[PDB]
């Protein structure tokens, strides 16, 4: 008898728009706009707090060390931190952005989770995602591993595995391409791993990259010791990737017996839904036809990067980003879905404009971890969301986050200091110890 | 007053043909043929010994730990070494080959070298190549770094840098894409970094991959502290890459004031040669027209993956692979070049069939390191080629290397043991200590 616990990423203070993710249309379209770090973190914390107060287990995962000077050094720039910062700013300012992204905030890509009810050894397994496709994102893995081990520290209940080798052949984007269908969270579930490409397969996107490879997905399934009979691999529809769906969570989401997805989500969709129907009792596929919502509208509103939550009476709630309400067509469809006879009996909207401008909605900011009562108790209590942490995190944000930020500001030695201090204090607040590289 | 010292790779015991390198036509064409590890090693040692006896400073770099079980475990396969070996063999035998390749033998891709005469701090710099394009090759970096630090141990004379981050954006293939033109080895030289692609540049191969990126090349130049006025970056002709030239040393080679290269080697070749002529005193470009030798014949014979050595009297010798003599056209051209009035006054041919079948000729098996008398003296004496080491290495090969091997054999637990013991013995022979992962 376990519960699904949502772990959201606390937006970092270097949050900015750099258009680093080709294939992520929001990122590319918001290229150099001014960002609001303070506001970004605030928006995220409100969603966290809201869901928490609504009775949905909520926790937080802290931001990373940014700017990340170690990697700049690795790239040949030497001297003291400030000196490297200076040199890079004047010689290769584009790298500055690459090592100063608040991207780890999208914890949906942090790792892939395997609830103890689906593993061979009966433990909760978490495999860090290499995020190799995007350089700025590939830097997250090491620190993310340190953070996950600092939060899920009971090694008798949790097994954190290191990321797969950093090569395109094993591109892994984590939970964002993962799905879990079944009855109650606590019972053994059916894991659906979605991938973009595989060796020897000519079926693959031709305009935008397929960040996830089947080879990676299969390795993670092994690493997480997922029972072979509870795993299924499906290929994302290449056509929809070429339109902006860089992660499965941008065109489909699962929860309990329901798989809410667009009609053009997968290749051989009919075979997959039939397979799920036969392998998952009570399976309900809610397909949205291109007729009611175009893939284009899907990518801009992020109706599928929503959180599908279970209410105590079995009914479900759809957590959506504000742009879903601001789009007549999609909002109209969501309400039709709401009124229709199905599990979706409530719509909840949040303003996550800062995150959405970089291609991340409600789901992208959270990592679902199904935990038993005993496992829930073994999680670092300091990261569980509640009044105390909420007020503390908001005060922390007001003390260190700026209201405005631009790539140009990333060179400011002052920003570097504020960030180091902010993280130092945060590590104490969250009882993580010296988890960041700069603290060692 | 320094000398160029050639460091060759001692072929490993797991040498086999797996067709793992798309873009490397030899590798692809010899896909699953049976290999002869013992012979492979012997062929290479003969070339080493011959050049050594001819008066050309020669050294050796040992093979790596193969099969590399740690990576298989990182891929989700658990249990004892033999258990992992078994599971992988039966579940994903293709991985077995990826972690059992003797690829590190091609040390021309081991790192990028910067002789003390070209560095800002006056030291010899070596930056390990990430070899990120090919998974099987990308595994080399860590051990390669350990080996280079065990050979070039005098930290006051040598600076070994770690490989660039492992992402396509920074694909680095080392010295194979490097060149150095100037007067005497000991004088400051002009380094020419050849790359296949760069961000924002539409000019790039469309069939085969461009393993080297300008971004990487620029970073290595920084890492190696190369004087800015002694550096030039040039792009490989994308058309020639799409024909099998996956490394610059498959289409061009430099030595002293000479740059021996095919006419279609670089993009904007005329401007590059004019640039070199103006910046390098006595510069001599020896261009081979498509009319005399086709790109196709260039890739099959490897006339350009030859070693261009300087004889005591300033004249030069061309070390070529057997296939250059077995090809009427190329052989005819080499002799014409030999008879023509130029530095090339001698042709030397070696049988490197085992290495050639996987796309590597004379140059691919060696890493050129220009060292001063004092730096030469600081190199681990145990790896310098001479009668003692030659006889010892041959006996070592006779004791541990098989006469035949196939991908199927890579699962043999006996192969794994032979390899571990062979390496342990070699570490002692070469006085390298516990340099391999399995020894720690
Ligand atoms: N849907 C999920 N699970 N995650 C969305 C993350 C968006 C992120 N954008 C960025 O990293 C853009 C950064 C910039 O351009 O500033 C990405 O492309 O990986
Ligand atoms: N010219 C230089 N400097 N190096 C050539 C190395 C050949 C190597 N072959 C391989 O890795 C193929 C192994 C196989 O497929 O079994 C490569 O492709 O990178
Ligand atoms: K409903
Ligand atoms: K000649």
UniProtKB/Swiss-Prot annotation, chains A, B:
The keyword Hydrolase applies. Induction: By nitrogen starvation, and arginine. Induced at stationary phase via sigma S. Disulfide bonds: none annotated. InterPro entries: AstB_sf, SuccinylArg_d-Hdrlase_AstB. Keywords: Arginine metabolism, Hydrolase, Stress response. GO terms for biological process: arginine catabolic process; arginine catabolic process to glutamate; arginine catabolic process to succinate. Substrate binds at residues 18-27, 109, 136-137, 211, 249, 358. It comes from the Bacteria. One of its GO terms (molecular function) is protein homodimerization activity. Signal peptide: none annotated. It catalyses: N(2)-succinyl-L-arginine + 2 H2O + 2 H(+) = N(2)-succinyl-L-ornithine + 2 NH4(+) + CO2. Homodimer. Catalyzes the hydrolysis of N(2)-succinylarginine into N(2)-succinylornithine, ammonia and CO(2). This is N-succinylarginine dihydrolase. It comes from Escherichia coli (strain K12).
């Amino acid at each position: 008898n376990a519960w699904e616990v949502n772990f959201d990423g606390l937006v970092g203070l270097t949050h900015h728009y750099a258009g680093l993710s080709f294939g992520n249309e929001a990122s590319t379209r918001h290229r150099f706009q001014v960002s609001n770090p303070r506001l970004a973190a605030k928006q995220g914390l409100l969603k966290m707090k809201a869901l928490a107060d609504a009775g949905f287990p909520q926790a937080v995962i802290p931001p990373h060390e940014r700017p990340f000077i170690p990697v700049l050094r690795q790239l040949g720039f030497s001297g003291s931190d400030e000196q490297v910062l200076e040199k890079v700013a004047r010689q290769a300012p584009h790298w500055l952005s690459s090592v100063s992204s608040a991207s780890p905030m999208w914890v949906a890509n942090a790792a892939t989770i395997a609830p103890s009810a689906d593993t061979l050894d009966g433990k909760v397994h978490l495999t860090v995602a290499n995020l190799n496709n995007k350089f700025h994102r590939s830097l997250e893995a090491p620190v993310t591993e340190s953070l996950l081990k600092a939060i899920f520290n009971d090694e008798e209940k949790f097994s954190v595995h290191s990321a797969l080798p950093q090569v395109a052949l094993l591109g892994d984007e984590g939970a964002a391409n993962h799905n879990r269908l079944g009855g109650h969270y606590g019972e053994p579930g059916m894991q659906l791993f979605v991938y973009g490409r595989e060796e020897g397969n000519d079926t693959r996107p031709s305009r935008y990259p397929a960040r996830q490879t089947r080879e990676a997905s299969e390795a993670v399934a092994r690493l997480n010791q997922v029972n072979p009979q509870q795993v299924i691999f499906a290929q994302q529809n290449p056509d929809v990737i070429d339109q902006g769906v860089f992660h499965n969570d941008v065109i489909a989401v699962s929860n309990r017996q329901v798989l809410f997805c667009h009609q053009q989500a997968f290749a051989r969709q009919s075979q997959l839904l039939a397979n799920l129907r036969a392998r998952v009792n009570g399976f309900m596929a809610i397909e949205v036809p291109a007729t009611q919502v175009s893939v284009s509208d899907t990518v801009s509103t992020y109706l599928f990067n929503s959180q599908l939550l279970s209410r105590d009476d079995g009914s479900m709630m759809l957590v959506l980003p504000q742009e879903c309400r601001e789009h007549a067509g999609v909002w109209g469809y969501l309400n039709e879905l709401l009124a229709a006879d199905n599990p979706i009996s409530e719509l909840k909207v949040f303003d996550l404009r800062e995150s959405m401008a970089n291609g991340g909605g409600p789901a992208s900011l959270r990592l679902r971890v199904v935990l038993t009562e005993e496992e829930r108790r073994a999680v670092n209590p300091a990261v569980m969301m509640n009044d105390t942490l909420f007020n503390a995190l908001n005060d922390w944000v007001d003390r260190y986050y700026r209201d405005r930020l631009t790539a140009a500001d990333l060179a400011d030695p002052q920003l570097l200091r504020e960030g180091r201090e902010a993280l130092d204090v945060l590590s104490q607040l969250l009882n993580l110890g010296s988890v960041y590289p700069f603290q060692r």
